[PDB]
Structure formats: C-alpha cells, structure tokens
Ligand binder design. Structure first.
Ligand code: VH1
Length: 358
C-alpha cells in the first residue's frame, strides 16, 4: 500500500568522472566537500600537483590551478580556500587572488575542517585548535586529545552552533572490526567525555512547552551490542525550559550487512529529521524528537565517503567512490501521507503537521 510515494526525494546532481576527474582521486584523502557549494579535488597530472574546484552552481566549468598542498579545503560559504603543505597552513582569497593568512604549526595537522563561515578546526596528534580566517590571530588550542583516540584515523570534527560543545571522531581497526571513538568536549566546563560512536551531529530543537531551543547531540554506533542511536541534550538548558528527555533507539542492519556500520550524519532542523548514512550506502531517516525510524533504503552502490548539509532542501548531499554526487531530502508533500499510511504513526504525523503550520 502506497508504494508509489516515498518520504524522501533522491537526486543525482553530478557525475565527477564526466568532468574529467580521475577515479583514483575520488576518495577521502583527495576530495573534500566542506559544504554543498564546492567540491575540491587534488590531482597530479604528469608531475604537476593541481587543485580542481567545482562550483556546484556552475559545475560544467571546473577550474584547475597548480598548487602544491597535501590538503585543500574550500570555505563553506565564500570563495576562500585553505591549503596545507606539511606544517605550513595558508588561507587564500580566490576572487582577489591574494593570501589572507598563514601559520606554521610545530606539530603536524592530521585532519582539518571548516566549522563555520570563518573558522577552521585543526587536529594534531595531541590537540584540537580553532583558527579564524580573519585578522591576525594564530590558531587557538581548544582542548587536548583524549587517550581513547590514540592511533585512530580521524574522520570528523564538528561543533554545536554556539561552539561550546566540540566533537572529535576517529575510527580504528581492532582485529576485523571498525571501532568508533569520539571525544565530546565542553568549552565551559573544560571536561572531555569519551564515547563509542561512529557518526554524529548537533542540532537546535524547540520542544513543545519551551520558549527557548534545546541544543541536541545525536550519535550513532554499531558496537558489540548492535546498532544504536542516541539523542541527548547537552549543556545547561535555557532558564525556563524543561530538559529534553534522552532518546535511545536501535539502528537496523539486515542480515546480509553484518559488516555495515554508520559513517555520516546530517540533521534537518526544518523537518526535525536525522539522516544517517552507512558504509554500504544505506540511508536512514529518524525523527529528531523521538528517534522513531521513518525510512531506510540503500541509495548508493558505492561507499559515500563525504557529506554536507544540502541547504536549499534541508537535506544531506554526498559523494560516492565512483563520483556520483547525490542528495536526499524530505519530500514535503509525501512524508505525512507516508507516515500515516505506511508507518501508521499518527502521533508523528500530527507533530510534523503542527510544526509545519508553525
Ligand atoms: N582556481 C583558483 C584556486 C585557488 C586560488 C587561490 N590562490 C591564490 O589566489 C594565490 C595567489 C597567489 C599565490 C598563491 C600561491 C598558492 S601556493 O603556492 O601556496 O599553493 C596558492 C594560491 C595562490 C591560491 O590558492 C585562486 C584560484
């Protein structure tokens, strides 16, 4: 019943191999997508190291520049790029063809990522720094890394909106398992919490009855106890709010997917939906308020190794290993019909409609 409609809209936006990208460079170490505005790829043509920038507003005309850099990350909002070559970091203004800032670290930066329109996060072996692209300021140490992450491949770093709750995520191979290790740091309390987790995100959510938004932390894991998803409030609740009751639900893997696990998460605050992507290319949607599982399907034949929020649709956009750029968002006309008649969850249908009416 109602097989003709889904609660989502799947889209393919590009195929990177048709834009002259070599498939060997379509991967985590060489292809970055810091937001839905740009894809940046490092490639070596002959002996010449190049950066290719694909503007997602005009993708058919990608720009190549010779640049020697071990990593290249575009700003989420503006035509600004950060480049690193060993311990030396530079940020450039593309439009004005000019250096903005530079810094030389004393420790190697194993992982970095833009966390806002103006700030880069730097992860060394022993600490995490935030670096403004503005003014003269050097990077500022935010916290020391927790021992639980020693030896991990760092795969993500993100923060809540107010940059008071900071989350570093790595993974390690423990025999034939991929074990997630997160470090949640409170800026205000100066406290770290180690957490076994594979993918996470923050979100603001205004509870019925509350005048102020709650800051939520959502993470997913597949550990020895199976797949789990948790949704918890972090930090002091605004004065006058009731606290958000913590949610803990299962994350389903079919029997043929014993080695699948979560790899990416983005949240729609417009729809209060969590998007989780798995290693095997499955997407799951969960209600942010309750953790109820709305939808699961395999949407990609290849692993999706990078994701961002998809702004215009409040969805999730990603790149897979073959170079498909794909996205998933709420289908706003069909989601409530699906919840009503396929999930048979009228409580959720009502909550969604109450929010939509505003
Ligand atoms: N297509 C494109 C890409 C990057 C830029 C920004 N940009 C620049 O605009 C730029 C201007 C002048 C010298 C530069 C040197 C270097 S590097 O030698 O340190 O890798 C990098 C840059 C640069 C640089 O990235 C402008 C246009």
């Amino acid at each position: 019943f109602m097989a003709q409609i889904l609660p989502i809209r799947f889209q393919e936006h590009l195929q990177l191999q048709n834009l002259g990208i070599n498939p060997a460079n379509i991967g985590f170490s060489t292809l970055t997508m810091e937001s839905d505005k740009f894809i940046c790829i490092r490639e070596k043509v002959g002996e010449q190291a190049q950066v290719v920038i694909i503007d997602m507003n005009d993708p058919s005309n990608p720009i190549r520049r010779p640049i020697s850099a071990d990593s290249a990350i575009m700003n989420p909002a503006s035509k600004v790029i950060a480049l690193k070559a060993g311990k030396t970091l530079q940020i450039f203004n593309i439009e004005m063809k000019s250096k903005m800032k530079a810094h030389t670290m004393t420790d190697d930066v194993t992982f970095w990522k833009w966390i806002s329109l103006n700030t880069v996060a730097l992860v060394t072996d022993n600490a995490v720094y935030h670096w403004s692209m503005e003014g003269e300021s050097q990077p500022v140490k935010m916290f020391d890394r927790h021992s639980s992450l020693a030896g991990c491949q760092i795969i993500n770093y993100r923060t809540d909106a107010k940059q008071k709750w900071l989350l570093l995520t790595g993974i390690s191979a423990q025999q034939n398992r991929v074990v997630g290790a997160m470090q949640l740091y409170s800026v205000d309390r100066k406290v770290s919490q180690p957490i076994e987790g594979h993918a996470a995100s923050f979100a603001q959510f205004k509870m019925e009855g509350n005048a102020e938004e709650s800051t939520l932390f959502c993470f997913a894991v597949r550990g020895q106890a199976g797949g789990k998803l948790h949704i918890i409030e972090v930090g002091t609740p605004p004065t006058g709010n009731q606290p958000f009751p913590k949610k803990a639900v299962d994350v389903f893997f079919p029997p043929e997917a014993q080695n699948d696990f979560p790899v990416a998460m983005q949240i729609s605050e417009k729809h209060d939906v969590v998007f989780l992507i798995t290693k095997y290319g499955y997407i799951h949607l969960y209600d942010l308020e309750t953790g109820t599982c709305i939808y699961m399907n395999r949407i990609s034949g290849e692993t999706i190794f990078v994701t961002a929020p998809h702004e215009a649709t409040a969805g999730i956009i990603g790149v897979n290993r073959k170079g498909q750029v794909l996205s998933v968002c709420v289908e706003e006309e069909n989601i409530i019909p699906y919840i009503t008649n396929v999930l048979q969850n009228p409580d959720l249908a009502l909550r969604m409609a109450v929010r939509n009416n505003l």
